[PDB]
Amino acid sequence: CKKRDDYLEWPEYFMAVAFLSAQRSKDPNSQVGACIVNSENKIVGIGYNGMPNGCSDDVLPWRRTAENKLDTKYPYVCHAELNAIMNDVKGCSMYVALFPCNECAKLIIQAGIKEVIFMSDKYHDSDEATAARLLFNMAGVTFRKFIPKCSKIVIDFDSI
Amino acid sequence: KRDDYLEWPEYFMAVAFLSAQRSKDPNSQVGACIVNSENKIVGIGYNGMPNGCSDDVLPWRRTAENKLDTKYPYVCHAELNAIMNDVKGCSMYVALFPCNECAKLIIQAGIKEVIFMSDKYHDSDEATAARLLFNMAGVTFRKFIPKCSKIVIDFDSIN
Amino acid sequence: DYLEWPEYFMAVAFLSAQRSKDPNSQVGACIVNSENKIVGIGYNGMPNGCSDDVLPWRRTAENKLDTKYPYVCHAELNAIMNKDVKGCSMYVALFPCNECAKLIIQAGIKEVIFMSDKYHDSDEATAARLLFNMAGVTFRKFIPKCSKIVIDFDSIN
Amino acid sequence: YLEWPEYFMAVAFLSAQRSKDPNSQVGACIVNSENKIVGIGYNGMPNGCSDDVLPWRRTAENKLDTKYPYVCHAELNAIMNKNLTDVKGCSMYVALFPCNECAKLIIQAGIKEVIFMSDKYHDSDEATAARLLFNMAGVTFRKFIPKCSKIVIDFDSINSRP
Amino acid sequence: DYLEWPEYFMAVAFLSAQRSKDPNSQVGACIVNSENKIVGIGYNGMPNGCVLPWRRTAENKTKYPYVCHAELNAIMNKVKGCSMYVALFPCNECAKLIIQAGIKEVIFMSDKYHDSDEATAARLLFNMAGVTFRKFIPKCSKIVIDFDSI
Amino acid sequence: DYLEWPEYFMAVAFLSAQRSKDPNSQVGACIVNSENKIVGIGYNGMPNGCSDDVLPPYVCHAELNAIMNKVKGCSMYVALFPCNECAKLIIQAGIKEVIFMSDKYHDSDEATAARLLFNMAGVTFRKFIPKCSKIVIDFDSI
Ligand SMILES: [Cl-]
Ligand SMILES: [Cl-]
Ligand SMILES: [Cl-]
Ligand SMILES: [Cl-]
Ligand SMILES: [Zn+2]
Ligand SMILES: [Zn+2]
Ligand SMILES: [Zn+2]
Ligand SMILES: [Zn+2]
Ligand SMILES: [Zn+2]
Ligand SMILES: [Zn+2]
């Protein structure tokens, strides 16, 4: 009687926590998650994109375009990376579904996170992503693309 | 806003079930998740051998002549590991109702509520003693009823 | 004539501003708990390990990547990252922008005490007020009993 | 004067006298690298369950009428009695060599050393399991050899003639 | 026999006192929070990193110029709204530390020096600052720790 | 022309002194860790709860209050060189360095005993020599 060979390994596990957390998002157009892990391979912070604490997802607007900027989500929304850090984390790594914008890059650096592991870099050519890479390069923060062993993971509550 | 997002009860129990998938135990995979009053996760655990103890030398079987040739003298339950990963005033989501030994730890850690998926062994001495201890310590417990039976995580969904 | 706690903490925020290497704008911030301990201090600048003269400080340029705005960190962000702060109050020179407002709310800060609100009618300021209103974070203008405070190191001798 | 190892073991033994267990009293003391006491424990019922309602007896018709299902060992209580954040890297002084269930806790807590006075149950299965886990995990353990066998605490000593 | 919390805490203070290398006085202190956790332990002695040199110079410029008191050491090892168990009623300097530490109660075994100026000054400081002090009355005078007992 | 850390921290010490209701003298102290974070601030005054008391001994020094207000390996910035009682507190707290502005009571018994204790225990004491002589906080600047 020996150990399992088919268990979930730690890299897929941490990114899966990020993607699971993203499913909590009330944003109809974008759901992103983040997971911060320390040198002990323990999770120290988790976040998803949404409105700030105490603020109703049925009181602030979710639309991406409007005549007045104040009628869009952008003045109000918190990115997954911000929420994970606000949930020390110095010498840690962040698993993220999407390469961080430059504003998140600032927080990541000031939080003392030394490594960002991303699933998608879909907006690589964006100003936001270009500024983020430059900040990480100057700060000595690693960023690398996650290459998963599997494309999907099933949580079955009836397995118990 | 979306009207199909993952709600927090299902999320916290999903975290416990995901963590259980890391277990090297061939017969039982159990996870637990501790959550504070701000609805933040403060601890996650699954069942396994202690830190630095190889899953190859230590036995995984459930029965043998000598108990030292079974997993029971060596294995750490999900609840222990969740706690060892303060937690005073928190809630614990766990796939299986805690044993009495886990109940002791849960009480001494200051956990106030236990939310469980399965109570398979309700009539066991372990579960019976666990309930009494919780009753006396003022730790409440309740069965979790999922909004659905499965959750799929797709890493390609971001693309 | 002794300095009061609020004057002291606003003084610490303004003092902290003088640490800034921004050639055009110097801003400071101080975070305090209910026991009147300073829990965080911040000033505006580039992220840790950066602008060793390398990132731009200019306010206008051909494209925004040549300006400081994609790179610079506000005093409020740095104060929060400079040491939890749940149940604390933040002393700021200027009313925080909506981006700092998000961070303040998520940090669990419950009170912002500001000197100036000169951009009150801006979208950034408006969004900040709305978010604080919804999150239950109060904000009040600081009324100093003294406009100036002099620190002379030779005063002791 | 009392040296530090004798002192920390004496705190463990003194703490055991807090126990309401009428047949066995065990104490444990957790100490960090600066010789600061970071946790103290003794054997007892869990928090909120100590008001002389649970059974202390060792034999009965039914196991649920004994102490064993309910009692917390000293090591468990010391660890749970202050994770000032944590007790990682600390040493535990305990009256008896820990059982294998306490071994699990001690390992997962990040304790690096166990100093014990008695190993009277060393030929036990539980003791063998404990040693295996400690040795595998890299937790060092050593038997305490005290400079003296008895320590007297006297409240009159502050007022009395030396 | 069985020890109640107060006897246990005073016993920790007295046990700690035995670590002292001071030949003239051995004093201990034990600081306890509202949940009966020990948050600080101290005994009297010389400063950290120290026959100490220059003693005659220090004496001329008390007979104990270098000593650090049990109460000072317990506080430095710690204190919210705690209680302090101490073998000997605190002096006036220790009273200030205890007040500034936030300690609300001092439980003392000996008040040998009640009529001293230090103790009088200490009582006044405690009364001004709202810090309770009360004399501890033990059951048995002696507690024996026997390492063979297991 | 930006303020550097040492001047900043001594300025905080001097700013803290102005919290003092003591009409005779005002001293301040600021404790800093190796990451340049303020971890404790103090000024001289009456014990907690006793600021409305006058008693024609009672006073708590800046250094004591800074340590009580929240430090092993830290540095303390102080407006005045510590007395011997504060030196004991500084040593037992594990503070490694005292940076002082004034030592105008150097030949006193108190300051001499303090130096002796710091010498025995290996606490470094450093005369602060500031770049700028004065700093002005201007609330109307915003
Ligand atoms: Cl793009
Ligand atoms: Cl940009
Ligand atoms: Cl805006
Ligand atoms: Cl066994
Ligand atoms: Zn972002
Ligand atoms: Zn269990
Ligand atoms: Zn801002
Ligand atoms: Zn045990
Ligand atoms: Zn004293
Ligand atoms: Zn002094």
Swiss-Prot record, chain A:
EC top class named in words: hydrolase
Regulation: Allosteric enzyme whose activity is greatly influenced by the end products of its metabolic pathway, dCTP and dTTP.
GO BP, sorted A to Z: cytidine deamination; dTMP biosynthetic process; dUMP biosynthetic process; nucleoside salvage; pyrimidine nucleotide metabolic process
Any one GO cellular component localisation term in the record: cytosol
Enzyme active site: E81
EC number: 3.5.4.12
Residues engaged in binding Zn(2+): H79, C101, C104
Keywords: Allosteric enzyme, Hydrolase, Metal-binding, Nucleotide biosynthesis, Phosphoprotein, Zinc
UniProt KW Metal-binding keyword: yes
Gene3D superfamilies named in the record: Cytidine Deaminase, domain 2
All copies of domain CMP/dCMP-type deaminase, residue ranges: 9-136
Cofactors, names only: Zn(2+)
Record GO terms (molecular function): 5-hydroxymethyl-dUMP N-hydrolase activity; dCMP deaminase activity; identical protein binding; zinc ion binding
Catalytic activity annotation: dCMP + H2O + H(+) = dUMP + NH4(+); 5-hydroxymethyl-dCMP + H2O + H(+) = 5-hydroxymethyl-dUMP + NH4(+)
Subunit note: Homohexamer.
Function: Catalyzes the deamination of dCMP to dUMP, providing the nucleoside monophosphate substrate for the thymidylate synthase/TYMS. Also, part of a nucleotide salvage pathway that eliminates epigenetically modified 5-hydroxymethyl-dCMP (hmdCMP) in a two-step process entailing deamination to cytotoxic 5-hydroxymethyl-dUMP (hmdUMP), followed by its hydrolysis into 5-hydroxymethyluracil (hmU) and 2-deoxy-D-ribose 5-phosphate (deoxyribosephosphate). Catalyzes the first step in that pathway, the deamination of 5-hydroxymethyl-dCMP (hmdCMP).
Family according to the record: Belongs to the cytidine and deoxycytidylate deaminase family.
This protein's name: Deoxycytidylate deaminase
Gene name, Swiss-Prot/TrEMBL: DCTD
Swiss-Prot record, chain F:
Keyword flag NAD: no
InterPro entries on file: APOBEC/CMP_deaminase_Zn-bd (IPR016192), CMP_dCMP_dom (IPR002125), Cytidine_deaminase-like (IPR016193), dCMP_deaminase (IPR016473), dCMP_deaminase-rel (IPR015517), Deoxycytidylate_deaminase_dom (IPR035105)
Superkingdom classification of source: Eukaryota
Protein source organism: Homo sapiens
Similarity comment: Belongs to the cytidine and deoxycytidylate deaminase family.
Annotated CMP/dCMP-type deaminase domain residues: 4-118
Enzyme category, top tier: hydrolase
Record text on subunit structure and interactions: Homohexamer.
This enzyme's EC code(s): 3.5.4.12
Activity control mechanisms: Allosteric enzyme whose activity is greatly influenced by the end products of its metabolic pathway, dCTP and dTTP.
Entry protein name: Deoxycytidylate deaminase
BP GO annotations: cytidine deamination; dTMP biosynthetic process; dUMP biosynthetic process; nucleoside salvage; pyrimidine nucleotide metabolic process
Amino acids binding Zn(2+): H61, C83, C86
Record's catalysed reaction(s): dCMP + H2O + H(+) = dUMP + NH4(+); 5-hydroxymethyl-dCMP + H2O + H(+) = 5-hydroxymethyl-dUMP + NH4(+)
Gene: DCTD
